[PDB]
Design an enzyme around this catalytic site. Structure first.
Site, PDB file in Angstrom:
ATOM      1  N   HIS A 140       0.849  -1.217   0.000  1.00  0.00           N
ATOM      2  CA  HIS A 140       0.000   0.000   0.000  1.00  0.00           C
ATOM      3  C   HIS A 140       0.874   1.253   0.000  1.00  0.00           C
ATOM      4  CE1 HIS A 140      -3.211  -2.879   1.204  1.00  0.00           C
ATOM      5  NE2 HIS A 140      -3.894  -2.091   0.348  1.00  0.00           N
ATOM      6  N   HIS A 194      -5.932   7.412  -3.317  1.00  0.00           N
ATOM      7  CA  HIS A 194      -6.988   6.559  -2.701  1.00  0.00           C
ATOM      8  C   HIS A 194      -6.457   5.802  -1.467  1.00  0.00           C
ATOM      9  CE1 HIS A 194      -5.082   3.248  -4.676  1.00  0.00           C
ATOM     10  NE2 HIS A 194      -5.859   2.429  -4.027  1.00  0.00           N
ATOM     11  N   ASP A 195      -5.152   5.649  -1.288  1.00  0.00           N
ATOM     12  CA  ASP A 195      -4.595   4.905  -0.112  1.00  0.00           C
ATOM     13  C   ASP A 195      -3.584   5.786   0.661  1.00  0.00           C
ATOM     14  OD1 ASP A 195      -5.849   2.286   0.069  1.00  0.00           O
ATOM     15  OD2 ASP A 195      -4.499   1.528  -1.448  1.00  0.00           O
ATOM     16  N   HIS A 225       1.810   1.502  -5.750  1.00  0.00           N
ATOM     17  CA  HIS A 225       0.395   1.057  -5.845  1.00  0.00           C
ATOM     18  C   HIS A 225      -0.468   2.233  -6.283  1.00  0.00           C
ATOM     19  CE1 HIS A 225      -3.464  -0.778  -4.914  1.00  0.00           C
ATOM     20  NE2 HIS A 225      -3.708   0.182  -4.026  1.00  0.00           N
ATOM     21  N   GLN A 252      -5.732 -17.757  -3.451  1.00  0.00           N
ATOM     22  CA  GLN A 252      -5.815 -16.953  -4.701  1.00  0.00           C
ATOM     23  C   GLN A 252      -7.018 -17.395  -5.531  1.00  0.00           C
ATOM     24  OE1 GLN A 252      -3.681 -14.319  -5.733  1.00  0.00           O
ATOM     25  NE2 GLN A 252      -1.677 -14.809  -4.834  1.00  0.00           N
TER      26      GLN A 252
END
Ligand SMILES: Cc1nc2ccc(CCc3nc(-c4ccccc4)cn3C)c(C)n2c1C
Ligand SMILES: [Mg+2]
Ligand SMILES: [Zn+2]
Length: 313
Positions: free
Chosen positions: A68, A106-107, A72, A269
């Site tokens: 993060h 956004h993060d 990213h 996954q």
């Protein structure tokens, strides 16, 4: 004013593709982002001096966590650039402006921990924001940086154009809370299938931008297999650190976050591609047909994880 950003030829061509990897040269990521704003929004959208100062403050407010992080942020913005460029006529001037910024932001100031961990730790942010804890924080950090001197990239917008773009950004960032994605995609599924989906309906556009945000945020599963495989290590390195911190609070983490259960990653996954990723890119392809390369790339990576399980790699 007559100052283009241009990229080396291999980047100039590949950056237009959904599966583009922004590469390991951090110092090129600002220029890659400016290039994308100029082509998807225009060279007149933002005062270059303010945009550059805004980008460098955003970068400074991303932390050195395994996943993060600033890479990213720029990766999620490139996926949005690819969606916007393949759907030229569907989005307003304000949406094009707001969504690349939303993606970059956004993060903001993520710590590598989920909303659940903050709530169990009893982090101050969990008292200020009872739901979508980190995402309300990310929007809050975006507004902070926009209000630094020389950082208002939206300064030329009218009072109500300004409120509209900040509202696009807030909804876009809140939508990156994966707990909200399941419900949002179900509603979009039903609207598309009963033929009620209407892009002049603002509440409908909002939902569709939400799904795009999920699609960009998950775009690690839409890369070429070696990129997808190596990003997955970063993703689990955060989850396992969180699992370790859960154990420090005296709580068995879920197996996803328990480094002792590494062996179940291939099967984990599969669940994720089947329950989240494929449904996400499927509904996105139904609403926006030119985003089909994202579904195709996701299916190819699901098939590579199946091969890992069969011990074919
Ligand atoms: C973009 C991206 N975003 C995410 C978010 C979550 C996950 C993790 C999926 C996942 N692993 C497990 C699991 C793993 C080992 C043991 C037991 C369970 C459970 N579950 C749902 C992945 C792989 N992501 C990717 C690729
Ligand atoms: Mg997030
Ligand atoms: Zn994200």
């Amino acid at each position: 004013g007559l100052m283009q950003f241009t990229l080396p030829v291999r980047l100039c061509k590949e950056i237009e593709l959904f599966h583009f990897d922004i590469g390991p040269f951090e110092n090129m990521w600002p220029g890659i982002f400016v290039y994308m704003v100029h082509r998807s929004c225009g060279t007149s959208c933002f005062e270059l001096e303010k945009l550059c100062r805004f980008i460098m403050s955003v970068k400074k407010n991303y932390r050195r966590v395994p996943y993060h992080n600033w890479k990213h942020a720029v990766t999620v913005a490139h996926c949005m650039y690819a969606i916007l460029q393949n759907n030229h006529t569907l989005f307003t001037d304000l949406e094009r402006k707001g969504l690349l910024i939303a993606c970059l932001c956004h993060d903001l100031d993520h710590r590598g921990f989920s909303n659940s961990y903050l709530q169990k730790f009893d982090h101050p942010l969990a008292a200020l924001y009872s739901t979508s804890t980190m995402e309300q924080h990310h929007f809050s950090q975006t507004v902070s940086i926009l209000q630094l001197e020389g950082h208002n990239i939206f300064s030329t917008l009218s009072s109500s154009e300004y409120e509209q773009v900040l509202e696009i950004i807030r909804k876009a960032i809140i939508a990156t809370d994966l707990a909200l994605y399941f419900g949002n995609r179900k509603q979009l599924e039903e609207m598309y299938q009963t033929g009620s989906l209407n892009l002049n309906n603002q509440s409908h556009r909002d939902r569709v931008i939400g799904l795009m945000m999920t699609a960009c945020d998950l775009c690690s599963v839409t890369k070429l297999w070696p990129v997808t495989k190596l990003t997955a290590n970063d993703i689990y390195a955060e989850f396992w650190a969180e699992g370790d911190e859960m154990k420090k609070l005296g709580i068995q983490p879920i197996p996803m976050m328990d480094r002792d259960k590494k062996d179940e990653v291939p099967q984990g996954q599969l669940g994720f591609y089947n329950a989240v990723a494929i449904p996400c890119y499927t509904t996105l392809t139904q609403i926006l047909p030119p985003t089909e390369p994202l579904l195709k790339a996701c299916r190819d990576n699901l098939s590579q994880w199946e091969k890992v399980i069969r011990g074919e790699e």
